[PDB]
From Swiss-Prot, chains A, B:
Active site as annotated: 351, 382, 511
Pathway the protein contributes to: Carbohydrate biosynthesis; gluconeogenesis; Carbohydrate degradation; glycolysis; D-glyceraldehyde 3-phosphate and glycerone phosphate from D-glucose: step 2/4
EC number(s) recorded for this UniProt protein: 5.3.1.9
NCBIfam families reported for this sequence: PRK00179.1 (NF001211)
An annotated GO cellular component: cytosol
Underlying gene: pgi
Catalytic activity, reaction form: alpha-D-glucose 6-phosphate = beta-D-fructose 6-phosphate
Name of the protein this chain belongs to: Glucose-6-phosphate isomerase
Amino acid sequence: RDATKLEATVAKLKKHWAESAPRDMRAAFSADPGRFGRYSLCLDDLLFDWSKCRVNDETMALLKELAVAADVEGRRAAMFAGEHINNTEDRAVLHVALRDTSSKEVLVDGHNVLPDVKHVLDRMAAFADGIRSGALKGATGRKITDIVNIGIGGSDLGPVMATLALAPYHDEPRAHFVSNIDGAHIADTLSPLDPASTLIIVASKTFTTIETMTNAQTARKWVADTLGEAAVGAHFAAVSTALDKVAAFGIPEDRVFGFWDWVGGRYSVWSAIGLPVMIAVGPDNFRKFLAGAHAMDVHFRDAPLEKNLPVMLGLIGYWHRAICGYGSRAIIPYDQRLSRLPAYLQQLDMESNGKSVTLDGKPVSGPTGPVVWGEPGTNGQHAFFQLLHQGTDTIPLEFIVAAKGHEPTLDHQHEMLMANCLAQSEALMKGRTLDEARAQLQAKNLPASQVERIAPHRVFSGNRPSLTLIHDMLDPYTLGRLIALYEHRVFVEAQIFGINAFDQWGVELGKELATELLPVVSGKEGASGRDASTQGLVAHLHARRK
Amino acid sequence: RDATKLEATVAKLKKHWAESAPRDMRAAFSADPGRFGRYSLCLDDLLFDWSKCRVNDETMALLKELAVAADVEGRRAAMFAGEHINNTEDRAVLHVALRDTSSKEVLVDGHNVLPDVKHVLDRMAAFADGIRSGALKGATGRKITDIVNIGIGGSDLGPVMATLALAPYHDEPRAHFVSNIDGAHIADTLSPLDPASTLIIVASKTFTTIETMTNAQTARKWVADTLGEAAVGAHFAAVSTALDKVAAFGIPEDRVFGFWDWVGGRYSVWSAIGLPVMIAVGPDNFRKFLAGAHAMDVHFRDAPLEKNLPVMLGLIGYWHRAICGYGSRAIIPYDQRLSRLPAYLQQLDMESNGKSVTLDGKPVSGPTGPVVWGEPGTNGQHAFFQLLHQGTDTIPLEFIVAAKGHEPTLDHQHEMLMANCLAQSEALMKGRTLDEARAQLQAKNLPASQVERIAPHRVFSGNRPSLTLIHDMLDPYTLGRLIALYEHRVFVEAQIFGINAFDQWGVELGKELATELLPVVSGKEGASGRDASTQGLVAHLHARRK
Ligand SMILES: [Ca+2]
Ligand SMILES: [Ca+2]
Ligand SMILES: [Ca+2]
Ligand SMILES: [Cl-]
Ligand SMILES: [Cl-]
Ligand SMILES: [Cl-]
């Protein structure tokens, strides 16, 4: 890594944005239709087109220089090598090992981790098969009809996202996900269910995660109240490494599935944490999900910078955020089954890159992670695209769509879906001028004064950037490949930012203060010494609760 | 409205923010604990506390001057009076009339709308009661067990949000919501259902909404394929005013429920669009939902500026966006049942205020609507609060929480939920200095070298603003009151921005281009000279579809 060169290149990119980057995208496309080919890449059926971004050959040359000066490639090699690149926590970062079916070995501290990874998946598969087949029954001999995952953050969003995304691959048992400490979540989830046919999965590495374990004890009582204490072992599984604590809870060791310190929560869906996903779609589908991620990993590791999809995606995201000054990015998947992808991507991106200090503990040099937000298309069009088109800020779009849906009789609806996806990016680029707006109103034969009055309200600046990702069909493999692409774009951006993508020290202060405030809120102690707002809110809660 | 006074006051606010607004919030609270009282207001049980925002008495006086200069009060009166304040469409704006049980008359174009409003509600209630009781059966004589709403935008987000929010008040029948043109949505929703016990509600004022009516024809074929053509009339209701088209489709007169041009989509959950919510919770609960909104309407209309909750919420929202420069705001409801509130507020806020021209068609003077986003607490803490605490940008928080949950046996979970809510706002304000981070590490007896290595990563800037809203319990009335609060804050901000909150010209370009693109995507027509990216994406789709 070359700090001087990196800084010089950042400055060149800012000068370039100011003086040389394309301003009129209609004109750029008109004069230079070759830009589609130059600013797109494929990996197998996956097409990544960033040609509607405000870039030219000089932009891409500078971005390559940036990737080189940031040592994206060397930092990547360190990750794959099992080096302790999570420096603040002194840990390896090896979510890639979780889906690695090609390497002979991957070493962490002198130990080949691959056999352990594969052994856990094998045990998960045997368990999932048994639950799915009815071979493994509840305490009164019933086939399990419902599974309830209990976890927070990374122990939840991945499982939810993937399970919903793979609905066509999921039959019985039904899958439910509890995460909020709010009692509404566990209460509303368990109330319609029968304990006799329900499996609870408790996802916590330590088995002391306060919110998860509080929910877990509520579920434990729900089982034991109806089926008796002895039934707990037939109605629970644990995703945990705290073998002492899982035994104390009454979960047999053959229903406990572990993972490792080098699996970050927001990168854990590939591990034992994905157990509810594997129960939902079956082990074969879960392994296809792993295989798709693995294909993206091999590509990420091996493709030269100019052909490397995640590197280009990270470079373009960095461009948008740090150089163009866009504070957010909207990720709009044109697939209702990806309804919970944006929320997943919020954790992956924002918790990784929402950082103000570098690896070495110094203040960062520019903006770091942007706000990530979105909803599926077409839904989002009818909620907030008004602002994306006519708002005062430019917000870059990341579009995702499949060439084929899963409904053989509704391909016409899929055609409308695709047309809308392509039309929105086209609209953001081309806009509509006052003359064009005027002409449309004149064609309705409105009075001249009304045309003149309304026309300015129908103007669209255009030149708003977007990129589009197209895959053949959202199947397990394609989903895995998509998530991995985003894991690696986030890695890339973090390296350019100079931050640790793999720690999360920013959650500690809230936890600390929540621990102090619990007995205060519960009426067990005073809010003496705290700020007057915290005091006033505590006082109000107490008054309203009395 | 005084444009020169308004510009002057904005300039004063910018100068005040730079030079005089509080920079050290710990000091601001410790020196002046009275700030909690001065920067909070109540309406009945509803507490609104903005004392953790970066404001003092001079900020608040300037914001009052701003409201006066913008003629917030005159514009509000014009809304309540039925004037055509949606000037670009030449329409009144009277969502407030939909819940108005106190006024003698509300006039639009000389006609009292209140009796029509109340008559539609009465008809909806009779229908809802019949469906709920089993008096109104399917074509083969079954009690309806499932309702499926089909709509886009404002015909979907409100129904979804409110039905989830009021889960404790919803028994039978089950409620489902279809919106995406993606065939996955209607197929996944209808697949498990029995047409014999299913009622489809088609929400489209025109009954020509392309996505909704495509979905509606798919649902109609689903009913007719199993039950026969004649059965359609017993399995559909319409929220529409297109009486000829509704009759042609097969929907009887007594199951069509209308609304008016002065009800905007994103303000429509109070109208006949709320029918599925009314079938879910019952008419008595729906009327309580309206009553809560009405209580907030009367307050908004009648309270003086500095005692007016929506006015002060809009002024603080404007301050954050236009003065402090915060491009987004995070709305974090500490209630799992409000899981779809942020998505609802995105449409309400962003589609209203994501505008670049003033009422008179001139370019706006500064930033308009911000990006609105969020997830419920505590879930969001474990997803993205890392970034909210330690990211490079400050993003203001709007917290919402209840003093009491619906599960007495889980009130300890509710105490944890409230403690986390208060801890997050406290943490955002207070932060943690380097010496404070070091002291925590030193208390764990870590080596000095480790203390110095780690401490900078555990620093929190603090001084990050938030406001908190507390209500006693999320019941129908409280939900109604909360949504109305946000309708009116959006109103208030729009008046300061000088824009039309009530049009949405920005959705037209995308629709236009999607209509054109459909036959090109389908292959029904050849190419016709679009940009190389659109062409490239089309060619890829054709290639992958065979
Ligand atoms: Ca399925
Ligand atoms: Ca203190
Ligand atoms: Ca800003
Ligand atoms: Cl996590
Ligand atoms: Cl004109
Ligand atoms: Cl009609």
